[PDB]
Write a protein that binds this ligand. Sequence first.
Ligand SMILES: CCCCCCCC/C=C/CCCCCCCC(=O)O[C@@H](COC(=O)CCCCCCCCCCCCCCC)COP(=O)([O-])OCC[N+](C)(C)C
Ligand SMILES: CCCCCCCC/C=C/CCCCCCCC(=O)O[C@@H](COC(=O)CCCCCCCCCCCCCCC)COP(=O)([O-])OCC[N+](C)(C)C
Ligand SMILES: CCCCCCCC/C=C/CCCCCCCC(=O)O[C@@H](COC(=O)CCCCCCCCCCCCCCC)COP(=O)([O-])OCC[N+](C)(C)C
Ligand SMILES: CCCCCCCC/C=C/CCCCCCCC(=O)O[C@@H](COC(=O)CCCCCCCCCCCCCCC)COP(=O)([O-])OCC[N+](C)(C)C
Ligand SMILES: CCCCCCCC/C=C/CCCCCCCC(=O)O[C@@H](COC(=O)CCCCCCCCCCCCCCC)COP(=O)([O-])OCC[N+](C)(C)C
Ligand SMILES: CCCCCCCC/C=C/CCCCCCCC(=O)O[C@@H](COC(=O)CCCCCCCCCCCCCCC)COP(=O)([O-])OCC[N+](C)(C)C
Ligand SMILES: CCCCCCCC/C=C\CCCCCCCC(=O)O[C@@H](COC(=O)CCCCCCCCCCCCCCC)COP(=O)([O-])OCC[N+](C)(C)C
Ligand SMILES: CCCCCCCC/C=C\CCCCCCCC(=O)O[C@@H](COC(=O)CCCCCCCCCCCCCCC)COP(=O)([O-])OCC[N+](C)(C)C
Ligand SMILES: CCCCCCCC/C=C\CCCCCCCC(=O)O[C@@H](COC(=O)CCCCCCCCCCCCCCC)COP(=O)([O-])OCC[N+](C)(C)C
Ligand SMILES: CCCCCCCC/C=C\CCCCCCCC(=O)O[C@@H](COC(=O)CCCCCCCCCCCCCCC)COP(=O)([O-])OCC[N+](C)(C)C
Ligand SMILES: CCCCC/C=C\C/C=C\C/C=C/C/C=C\CCCC(=O)O
Ligand SMILES: CCCCC/C=C\C/C=C\C/C=C/C/C=C\CCCC(=O)O
Ligand SMILES: NCCOB(c1ccccc1)c1ccccc1
Ligand SMILES: NCCOB(c1ccccc1)c1ccccc1
Ligand SMILES: NCCOB(c1ccccc1)c1ccccc1
Ligand SMILES: NCCOB(c1ccccc1)c1ccccc1
Ligand code: NA
Lengths: 636, 636
Amino acid sequence: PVFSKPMDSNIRQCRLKKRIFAAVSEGCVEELVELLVELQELCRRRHDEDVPDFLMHKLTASDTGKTCLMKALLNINPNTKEIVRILLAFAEENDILGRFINAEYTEEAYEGQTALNIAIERRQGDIAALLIAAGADVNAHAKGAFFNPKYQHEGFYFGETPLALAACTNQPEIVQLLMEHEQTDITSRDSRGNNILHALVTVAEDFKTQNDFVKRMYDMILLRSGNWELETTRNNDGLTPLQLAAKMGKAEILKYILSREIKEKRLRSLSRKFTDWAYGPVSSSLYDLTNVDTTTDNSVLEITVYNTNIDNRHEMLTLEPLHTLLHMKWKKFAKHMFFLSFCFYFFYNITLTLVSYYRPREEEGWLQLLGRMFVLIWAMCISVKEGIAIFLLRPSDLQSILSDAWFHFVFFIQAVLVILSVFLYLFAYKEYLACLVLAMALGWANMLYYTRGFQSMGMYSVMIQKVILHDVLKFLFVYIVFLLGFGVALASLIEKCPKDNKDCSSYGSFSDAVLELFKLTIGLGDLNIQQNSKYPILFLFLLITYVILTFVLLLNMLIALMGETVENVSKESERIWRLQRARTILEFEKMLPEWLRSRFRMGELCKVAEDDFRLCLRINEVKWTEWKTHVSFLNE
Amino acid sequence: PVFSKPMDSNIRQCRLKKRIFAAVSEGCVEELVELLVELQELCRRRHDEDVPDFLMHKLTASDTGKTCLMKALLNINPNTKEIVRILLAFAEENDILGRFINAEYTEEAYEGQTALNIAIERRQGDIAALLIAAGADVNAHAKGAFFNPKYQHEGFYFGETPLALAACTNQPEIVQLLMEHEQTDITSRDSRGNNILHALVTVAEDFKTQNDFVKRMYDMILLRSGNWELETTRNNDGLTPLQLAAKMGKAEILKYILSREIKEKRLRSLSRKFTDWAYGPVSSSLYDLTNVDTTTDNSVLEITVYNTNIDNRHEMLTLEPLHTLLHMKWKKFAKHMFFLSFCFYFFYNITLTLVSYYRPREEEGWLQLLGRMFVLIWAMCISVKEGIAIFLLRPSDLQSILSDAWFHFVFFIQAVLVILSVFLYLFAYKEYLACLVLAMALGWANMLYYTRGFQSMGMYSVMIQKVILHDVLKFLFVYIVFLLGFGVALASLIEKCPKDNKDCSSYGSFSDAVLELFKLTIGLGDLNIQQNSKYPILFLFLLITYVILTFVLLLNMLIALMGETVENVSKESERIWRLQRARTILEFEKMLPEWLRSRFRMGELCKVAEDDFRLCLRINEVKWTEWKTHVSFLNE
Ligand SMILES: CCCCCCCC/C=C/CCCCCCCC(=O)O[C@@H](COC(=O)CCCCCCCCCCCCCCC)COP(=O)([O-])OCC[N+](C)(C)C
Ligand SMILES: CCCCCCCC/C=C/CCCCCCCC(=O)O[C@@H](COC(=O)CCCCCCCCCCCCCCC)COP(=O)([O-])OCC[N+](C)(C)C
Ligand SMILES: CCCCCCCC/C=C/CCCCCCCC(=O)O[C@@H](COC(=O)CCCCCCCCCCCCCCC)COP(=O)([O-])OCC[N+](C)(C)C
Ligand SMILES: CCCCCCCC/C=C/CCCCCCCC(=O)O[C@@H](COC(=O)CCCCCCCCCCCCCCC)COP(=O)([O-])OCC[N+](C)(C)C
Ligand SMILES: CCCCCCCC/C=C/CCCCCCCC(=O)O[C@@H](COC(=O)CCCCCCCCCCCCCCC)COP(=O)([O-])OCC[N+](C)(C)C
Ligand SMILES: CCCCCCCC/C=C/CCCCCCCC(=O)O[C@@H](COC(=O)CCCCCCCCCCCCCCC)COP(=O)([O-])OCC[N+](C)(C)C
Ligand SMILES: CCCCCCCC/C=C\CCCCCCCC(=O)O[C@@H](COC(=O)CCCCCCCCCCCCCCC)COP(=O)([O-])OCC[N+](C)(C)C
Ligand SMILES: CCCCCCCC/C=C\CCCCCCCC(=O)O[C@@H](COC(=O)CCCCCCCCCCCCCCC)COP(=O)([O-])OCC[N+](C)(C)C
Ligand SMILES: CCCCCCCC/C=C\CCCCCCCC(=O)O[C@@H](COC(=O)CCCCCCCCCCCCCCC)COP(=O)([O-])OCC[N+](C)(C)C
Ligand SMILES: CCCCCCCC/C=C\CCCCCCCC(=O)O[C@@H](COC(=O)CCCCCCCCCCCCCCC)COP(=O)([O-])OCC[N+](C)(C)C
Ligand SMILES: CCCCC/C=C\C/C=C\C/C=C/C/C=C\CCCC(=O)O
Ligand SMILES: CCCCC/C=C\C/C=C\C/C=C/C/C=C\CCCC(=O)O
Ligand SMILES: NCCOB(c1ccccc1)c1ccccc1
Ligand SMILES: NCCOB(c1ccccc1)c1ccccc1
Ligand SMILES: NCCOB(c1ccccc1)c1ccccc1
Ligand SMILES: NCCOB(c1ccccc1)c1ccccc1
Ligand code: NA
């Protein structure tokens, strides 16, 4: 990144004020005392009306706003605490201690950063305790391009508050010192709208390491708060800390929140998992479904399934209510809607076939009327439905067209070519055969959409798409190099044939020469040596050189590259069809009306505590492997 | 799973009795004393004839049968023992202690569960000792759908007795407390017929982990019993704990039982392995063959070989008498019966060939009579023998048709088509050639059955079957998509040819078009551009698009998927032919008569102890690697 002005500067890029910053940096105590006396006497020699203002302009930098207190804290030495006790005592007789401890940068990239923001970051618990006990602001919002970047490489976002700075830098002794302070606003929201619990989700990691202080900071702040105000708070985008963990793909944080159970009464009401009974490996629990089920707009189940930015959707959709809601919707409507979508579309491809095969060749019942009117209606049903999904779609397709958004185009292109064949055939035109045949060939080719979501057949549609997009299209630029180079080369040697006998040279034009050289590449060629040219040996040299390069080397090079794609999909094949069915379920739920979706709703009302009635889900879990390993070491 | 009623419930799904259950749960001692006095005085205000009955209806739940003693034990707190001592003393002055400690659930899914079943499961050795010393039933059978499920995901099966509950949950201090109790029936059988040693086999694991308490519970209960009553006990299916370990595939338990040797006299008679002498790496032992050799009906060797449900047959057939009986039967009859089965069937395929090749073309010795009568008899011998094996076979073929039950059909189908060709040729019909040729081609194709069971040739028959069933048939649904789509597409562009010259377009029909498109896929095709249509460029576009998809992409995609199958069989190839020969031996033993099987019987009578004469087998084992590692650390 770049900021065009440093935070601290001690190297110059090629007199009372400049010596004070050169005294608080190295740690010269006896020099700093002699310099402050020279500035204490320099207040009254010309005026006594402006004492509190003139004392501040000689201790602050006029370009950044950095004070002499900030300069001592940016440069940590073992003589640091002695400098702070002198500078805070110097503002006592001048009565300027109120504005000296609450100063901030006036520069646009570090605006709002105070001396308390530096002392907590340098791990100075004794110095930060002296500032708060003197009048430092515990609610100072450090804005700016450095503290509020646009990406995670152009600064450092922690939450803009001193409570979020100690929480993100693993310092719980300062968090306990700030939460006991009665002027600290815990539920404060920064420029992003994030509170103390949104900012911990942002700095969290995606997987489980050895030390997880973010989960420890999440539990410590939430239980000492003792309310739901930090959890129901939404951002400027309208996201809770539960929904933010699903958006950014933090599976360890999303697992902890969504099965949080507190056994202690006076603290039990802050739970989302409620175990009813347990007997060995069998447990019965109640799970909160407040923002999880798809009854609100931006629900957690809708985020995780449609989150193409992240890599761990299979880890997050295995979690504790998310796998059961996804399974119960399949056994109620989504298996029925997938079977009928197969049946109405397989009947649609047969009717396209039997009107394309039995077309009126030269001369130009109730079941025949039932067939052709079904073609005109079902093609308009797809072109409206798939046309909305393309319009409601963003142009950054590198992550959505993996297996998902590729089918939204080919069902739409096939539906338009059926409709375009109607306008051509009826009016006056003969180009209907060019549109009806290509729609029928693409119509049968779209039957591989119904192989998706199954353990045995789900990986075949991914193998076809990933070979085309990642192996074949990047290999056309290697092969057209040799197809167009040798194509003009062999066509230039062919002499103009004497008048008759058009089968005297197959390479007699550039359009001819590309055809046979494509046949030598795939192996349907002919090494003809008749070939009436003035250079028979030179034609025979470049013809065999083409066969060795394309057929022997470049053809088997592509097969070795396509074979690496097939084995990579086959290793991930158990994770593919589980993510294919998960998107198929939620698209079928959006096709349902409101009166029918209300019958399909899961959940029952519970009595958690006094004035607490939330929507639950009873999930009977049995864990044999986790039980046998648990019992074994209690009696080793 | 689902049970529609919980064991314990503390969350309500949206007055003297209800306060007692709300007193024993949290642990309020001073509240519970005040509530019992209010119920002690509420016995005599309206009648004194029904004291023992009315005292029980106010302390038990009328819907499940759960008492107040069970409610305190389901909710473990540090104030648990104080509640139990009050409730057991409360039943003393009322003289209702006999029916208060022996109560059970009246609900159909938890019937028979008592307070002793809960106290042992919650690890309360002090509370369970107070119940047994007061009159609790140590032989209470906890039946129900939860405690007796149908699968291992719909409950928790442990053995239905309190002795089996402490044994399966790794609690030997309660097992020693129950086996010293003189009213405890150790040889009790539950609803499955399982005893204390069958139930440990059911909860056992298939492989060797770090901690194996199941083997420790098996040894501790059996040696303190001191008899063979627990070992000879059979289930409702007729299974000993030795035969149950072979049925469920527990190799660690089946290894421990089948080489159990106790060196201590007064305890030596409970052994199955008897070491005769040992000198360094060479040892001579005698192994018990009571239910192991194939002289009883449901023997251990017959179970393990024919156990297609399990994955570790190679680990279990390597064990200590099972590998020697399998090897001694091969060197006595099974190598001779496999060689003659090769010779009588190779002579059968030659005679089918020489009557199919030298058939009467147009006009319609003793060795010729010997040949054709051998065909009529040997085809009836296979059709009777293989017809019984199909009839005695279950329709769940996903695990038996791997390499084993596939040959029972193709020897039968080949034998019927020989017999069907006799009825067609003799009577009046000319369809004998359609049955004799397909039987002769399948007859030579069944010669790969005799490649089975050999280290160099055994894996080839598995590679052919696994490629067809797991790669090819799941790829037809990918390819008929492109074969039927482009087949009608290219046939619809072909104009009806002017009258003569049938070789004007090869795609002139749908039956024609499938033939050449199959030839372009395998690589025997032709990119003809003559092709008299009204769309020569549009025909040429879809023809090359078919070649790039099928021949270049989809053909090499299948080869990459078939190549993963070949390398997976080649890695498991040493485990395949050892399991192929093991099934070949036991099928040849069933073909033997009783007088000839008695000559082939292994074993000699031994004198183990007084009144103990069992059938042995002397196996001279030498273990060089296990000896050199053993001696090395005794003198490090
Ligand atoms: C303009 C356009 C408008 C469109 C109108 C639509 C909009 C309005 C719609 C309204 C519909 C209303 C909702 C549906 C409610 C029905 C309830 C139901 O029975 O569902 C059931 C399915 O029932 C079945 O019969 C499934 C049959 C087997 C499917 C096999 C999948 C393969 C499909 C072809 C793939 C071939 C692959 C080969 C290669 C390609 C749910 O499943 P289940 O059976 O209950 O689960 C068993 C569990 N249980 C029984 C224990 C509970
Ligand atoms: C997944 C998809 C896979 C498949 C998709 C692949 C699809 C490829 C399909 C290919 C089919 C090609 C058909 C050709 C049609 C005619 C062309 C023509 O007119 O040429 C003429 C000139 O011929 C020349 O001299 C060629 C010069 C072209 C300059 C190339 C620059 C751009 C190439 C950038 C590449 C370098 C980039 C480098 C980066 C590494 C010859 O004309 P004619 O034949 O004699 O006509 C007879 C005239 N008459 C009719 C009146 C008698
Ligand atoms: C209606 C239908 C009725 C059916 C009637 C039947 C029912 C009644 C039946 C009654 C039969 C009675 C039982 C048999 C007793 C014989 C004893 C015997 O000698 O056995 C021996 C076999 O000796 C041999 O002769 C084996 C010859 C080599 C075989 C090689 C295997 C390859 C076979 C072709 C594969 C080609 C693969 C190529 C690719 C395809 C046992 O072996 P061994 O030699 O002893 O072992 C050496 C150990 N020792 C010598 C140290 C001890
Ligand atoms: C291990 C095993 C591997 C090998 C086994 C593979 C074996 C495959 C073998 C294949 C050989 C095929 C031979 C065809 C025989 C004739 C058929 C016919 O009559 O067609 C007629 C209509 O033609 C059409 O219009 C086709 C329409 C059929 C509808 C398809 C629906 C079901 C497909 C479900 C698939 C989608 C499922 C989607 C799931 C993803 C054309 O007839 P004709 O030709 O003009 O006849 C001339 C008439 N005359 C004689 C009087 C002159
Ligand atoms: C999946 C992997 C893809 C890539 C790998 C590829 C390999 C695997 C792919 C396998 C796919 C199989 C494609 C076969 C092509 C059929 C051609 C055809 O139509 O026959 C003929 C039709 O003849 C008939 O009318 C009667 C039908 C006989 C067809 C028997 C073919 C074999 C069937 C299954 C064999 C099972 C073997 C199982 C072995 C394990 C041709 O028609 P015609 O006679 O010329 O026209 C007559 C004119 N008329 C119109 C007047 C009538
Ligand atoms: C990269 C991997 C390499 C190794 C693997 C190989 C596989 C991958 C390789 C792919 C490379 C593709 C090479 C195709 C060769 C074309 C031949 C040709 O020129 O056509 C014809 C020209 O016809 C015309 O005049 C109009 C052009 C139509 C050409 C359409 C061909 C398919 C286009 C793309 C299909 C997209 C399918 C996408 C499927 C995913 C032949 O000419 P002619 O008619 O005989 O001459 C007439 C005489 N005249 C001169 C007077 C005019
Ligand atoms: C998986 C769930 C399935 C969902 C529903 C699927 C069910 C779909 C079932 C039927 C759909 C058809 C209804 C459309 C009505 C119009 C038909 C038409 O065009 O006329 C044709 C009549 O039909 C024939 O005679 C064609 C015979 C070959 C058909 C091959 C059988 C496979 C397709 C069907 C079986 C598929 C079974 C699938 C499995 C059940 C024209 O033929 P013609 O006599 O020559 O007329 C002379 C015209 N000419 C003068 C120009 C020459
Ligand atoms: C890949 C794209 C570029 C292709 C290579 C370009 C690079 C070339 C660079 C330099 C070559 C410079 C010399 C060639 C010029 C004269 C040739 C000549 O006149 O023909 C002669 C012989 O025809 C031949 O067979 C000559 C051999 C071809 C030369 C290739 C060099 C070897 C490189 C090998 C590496 C493999 C290739 C690369 C693979 C990694 C004449 O014979 P004629 O025809 O019967 O005519 C008789 C009439 N006359 C005698 C009066 C004439
Ligand atoms: C591994 C253990 C081996 C087990 C036993 C195997 C031993 C098998 C041994 C013999 C089997 C034969 C017994 C059946 C008797 C009937 C034959 C018949 O149909 O008549 C044929 C006579 O025979 C010939 O003339 C055919 C000559 C070619 C045979 C090729 C040798 C390979 C098979 C043999 C050697 C395999 C050796 C295998 C290794 C020992 C008809 O021929 P024809 O003269 O043209 O008659 C005119 C008819 N016409 C007028 C219609 C044209
Ligand atoms: C896979 C199954 C589906 C196959 C594709 C279906 C999707 C298509 C979707 C949309 C296509 C919409 C436009 C086509 C309709 C008009 C075409 C036409 O009239 O022919 C013209 C040229 O013939 C051609 O060569 C045109 C090229 C074919 C179009 C394919 C789009 C490119 C996709 C590439 C991707 C590779 C394919 C997919 C591989 C991943 C006319 O030429 P003529 O014949 O000589 O007749 C002359 C007389 N006339 C001028 C008066 C007419
Ligand atoms: C507006 C039209 C623009 C031109 C058309 C471009 C692209 C659409 C046409 C074809 C794309 C798909 C072809 C199907 C072939 C192989 C994929 C099999 C299905 C799968 O993936 O399993
Ligand atoms: C009642 C008849 C029904 C139709 C017949 C269906 C199936 C039997 C026919 C053929 C099956 C086997 C064919 C042999 C081809 C390859 C396998 C090689 C032998 C092996 O596996 O090593
Ligand atoms: N069969 C259990 C596999 O889990 B499923 C699953 C697991 C992870 C991610 C997505 C789905 C599942 C499959 C179908 C319907 C509902 C859930
Ligand atoms: N909207 C018109 C067709 O939509 B359906 C549809 C079409 C293609 C792919 C997926 C869905 C459909 C959905 C449920 C039942 C039947 C058809
Ligand atoms: N050659 C020793 C291999 O062990 B054999 C074997 C090992 C494990 C499982 C099954 C068999 C064996 C092979 C043939 C006959 C008897 C035993
Ligand atoms: N039962 C009629 C043929 O059976 B035998 C058989 C046939 C096919 C496969 C396996 C065995 C047979 C067995 C031993 C010796 C000779 C033949
Ligand atoms: Na390879």
